[model samples]
Target chain A: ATKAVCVLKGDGPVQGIINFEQKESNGPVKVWGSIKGLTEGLHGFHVHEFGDNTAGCTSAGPHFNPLSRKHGGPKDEERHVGDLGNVTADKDGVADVSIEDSVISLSGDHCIIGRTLVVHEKADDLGKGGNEESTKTGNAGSRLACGVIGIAQ
Target chain B: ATKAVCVLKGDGPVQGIINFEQKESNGPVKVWGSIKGLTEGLHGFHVHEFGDNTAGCTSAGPHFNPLSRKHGGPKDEERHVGDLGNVTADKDGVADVSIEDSVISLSGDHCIIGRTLVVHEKADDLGKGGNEESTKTGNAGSRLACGVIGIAQ
Candidate 1:
């Protein structure tokens, strides 16, 4: 089946931008973007379920952790489905990174078209080097920024 | 009551970057920002009722046009309450503008904290100039870009 993609941008504390693309070929959808005006350190990035933009970013709901697993880093095989890993910011509070994953789809029932993107205030420990509860991923702090995923024109 | 003012940045044909703030004063909240990567023209801008970011920007619901007024420019007194006016992009596809309004609030029942900023594919014709049966603000056309208005840090 043909695939569709969407692009989303954040509007608050953090002003990074992201693009979601789905390729016709059988593989993971591609997510890429650059974030600026951050805290100049590590932060958590993930896909969220609801699209309620009312509470501002809070309306985006929890991470798109369909698996109902605990929050963890993207690299962990047993982490939450919403995890896309982590994006670190430089001293200038800028992060530029890209990642691909099958967990996030562009079309069909599992499509993330209406999902949201959330940026945490702290860095993720990648589930291996931090708190046991954070063993899956560092317990990133408060939400820093958020935006919904939309179709790319 | 307090007021909530939001501003958006034009990113492209179907993407908008938004920013929001709250004020205790009774005057209209002020919104300012720059939009880039537009199609080089004027586009409709407005506030939606619901905060649902689920449909990406689509879930934000219809314009808060409780008066059922006609679609017009942002400054038109007879225009929809959702209307904050229009933004024009330069040759480089960038639009920089500032707007203020008193009809909405950011911290109270009428708060726009979770509302959305929607960018349309066409310009608003001020009602008297456009298609008649259209209910939305200007029938401005397709949802080009969307962003949730969040509270400032």
Candidate 2:
């Protein structure tokens, strides 16, 4: 099995600990985590191409689009591998994340290790915003928090 | 000023939060952090080439030696820019890391924002172990924990 963990932090009070598990090489990925200090609502979440945060989330580059696909929802057939759609936070500013994806692997050419995982400030339109930035970023707004994925086991 | 932060986690109980600050573009870097759950002794710490952890710390590649210099101590005239020497842990298994380097930048061609910060299981020889591997890795043992550098502000 291949497992990884990411500890998220930002300029604000936003913080989190995310875990990734894959049963085998090139297997589906299971993600679990809890983010705090976000506004009560949906926030776009995705794997970014670069772990660089020299300029905060702005330097994380774009979505992890190895195939150069457009941004879409988690279950959309045509979407970047990084697209995991939106996560909702409660009134207390907590978002318990649970996701499973068959295409995202932990050990392959498209492996996401070393990349950045970003939590956005606004809900993801899932490429349905009907705007130019919609297909590019789902208009997720500014990044609130992010972290780099590394081996947990 | 440029600032970045990294949250470290490993397979074990090791964990930490490191902060990096550079007062100017391509200026010296100031590092401060506290790592816990390590043995009460000195541990080698350095910046690795890759943030990848697909195989745990083994996949993080080698030290961030873009200049291909021989591994040496942090204060050595000839050393890899990633070399920051050893960090001492107390009886409580907590290491308070404080370091400053003039060669490491956060916004240059050699910027280390996306690199991996590694803590080793054993004391780094600082290229003085008089062995082949010593000059390559400072004979730093297995990786204890690591994290990717990202923007903090």
Candidate 3:
């Protein structure tokens, strides 16, 4: 069984968990995550490069672009392994999203285990904000929450 | 499954291996290792802070001092869980040391698996040098080699 989870960490609001599971070997990763305390609207959600949460969320480095693809939406064919698009929070300041992504795996070379899960303040433009940082980090504002991915028992 | 953490050969000339064995009953872990290419003297050994070895030994962060105690030899009653003391190398530059530490375990609250193992150039003073840095790292010199703990066969 290949599975991992991340308990989002933040100071302002937005703290929750993301559960990762690989239903089959070398298959898509089923991701389930939720966060509390967010502004109404869309927010950027992606995995960062490193999982070392020693300093905090920002210390996890940039997006998990091991394959070196441009920053785009999770559905984009050539985006980062961590580009999970965005999650829309409700007026009550809560967001929950579940997705099955082929880009990331729970086991093997592209595994996201022992990595960082992050939620950005602003909305992700899905790689079309039309600026340098847009293609770089979705113009995601201050990081609201961060978490380290660990094996889910 | 068994568990192990090998000291990866790095910038330093000496290289060694530290294998970890877990007790199903949640007792102390059994550890054993053999290293090569030392300077025929005592060398400091320890488990580092991070399992992430992207930037090499220093990248592994400080010693694994979870309880926040003064640095001391492994057998010391009050010491960091990472304080495994020093390993001696023969004139032939081969280091082979073995010990079962009570401070570290493969399971429970103080697990050592998936952390970084580091071998230093100088012997650790064990926070008894009466200096400022002594309490920090026992004055262990540059990191000669490192390895990441992993699950064994």
Candidate 4:
């Protein structure tokens, strides 16, 4: 088994902790985490290609698309491995996330470690916006918070 | 200014904290840190392309070589950007590393954040080993310790 963790941080007050665990090689990845300070409702969550937050979350870049796939939800076959779908926030501005993703891996070529985990300002349209940005980014709005996914025990 | 940190860990009893700082975009990067639990001599220190440490340090992958260059010493012009040369360990098995590198960056295309920082078991041959592996890896032996480079304030 392999494990990883990300401690979210950004320019604003947002904060969170995310954990990723894989029970076996090439198996489904179990992701769990919580992000605070987001608006009430769903916020787009995805793994970006770069973990470089040198200039805020902008350096995190776009969704990790190593497979060159289009933007889609976690369950969509056409989705990018970075697409983990949305994380809903409660009235307290806290988003609790728990998901099992079959596309991403902690090992192998599709491994997501060393990438960026991001929380967007708005819900991801999952390529349903029917616009240029939708297909590429699912129309996910500005990045609110992000962190680097790092190796763990 | 930008900064990043990597907390190195591996199968053995090695541990260390390496910090990178860049005062301006495209400027030289200042790296400082201390690595403990190494042999009393020089060891290879490099930034790998992946931060994936799934099975020991193997998942860290090869040295980051975005420029598609050959392996060489830190001072060589024909070296990979990931090459930072060697860190010498004292009699107490502690390597006090302090270097200023112009090739790597904390931002832009060459940004190394979210990558893997690795410490090798043996000294790097600096591409002078006269072999195939030497041209690619400087003939640096097994990875002894590794960790993902993450954003810092």
List A-chain TM-scores for all predictions. Answer: 0.82, 0.96, 0.96, 0.97
lDDT of each: 0.63, 0.83, 0.76, 0.84
Segments in model 4 whose C-alpha atoms lie over 4 Å from true places:
A1-153
Q: What's the candidate order when arranged by decreasing lDDT?
A: 4, 2, 3, 1
The sequence of per-residue lDDT tens digits that candidate 4 reaches over residues A1-153 is 888877676677778888899999899999997889888998889998765654557877788888898999998989888999899999999888899997988766787776789988899999889898998888878888887797553
For model 2 the interface RMSD, in Å, equals 6.3
Question: What DockQ score does model 1 reach against the true complex?
Answer: 0.05
The parts of candidate 2 lying over 4 Å away from their true place are A1-115, A119-123, A126-146, A149-153
Task: Tell me candidate 3's TM-score on chain B.
Answer: 0.92
Number of backbone collisions per candidate: 25, 0, 1, 0
Q: What is the lDDT of candidate 3?
A: 0.76
Q: Write the per-residue lDDT of candidate 4 for residues B1-153, one digit (tens) a residue.
A: 987777787789777988899999999999999999999998999998865644557877888889999999999999999999999999999999999999999877787876789999988999999899998988789899987797554
Listed in order, each prediction's TM-score against the native is 0.51, 0.60, 0.54, 0.57
Docking class of 1: incorrect
lDDT for each residue of candidate 2 in B86-135, tens digit (9 for 90 to 100) = 99999999999899988777766677765688999999999999999999
Model 1 Cα lDDT, one tens digit per residue, B1-153 = 322223343334544444444456455677666666678898877776544444455656777665777666566667666677678888888777677777655544445554567777787665655456353567677667766554343
Over 4 Å off, model 3: B1-153
Q: Mind giving the per-residue lDDT tens digits that candidate 3 earns over A1-153?
A: 666666676778678877788988789888887888999999999888765443456667888887888999987886888899898899998898788898888766676765677899999998899999988899987889876565544
Model 4, residue B43: distance off in Å is 0.2
TM-score of chain B of each: 0.78, 0.97, 0.92, 0.98
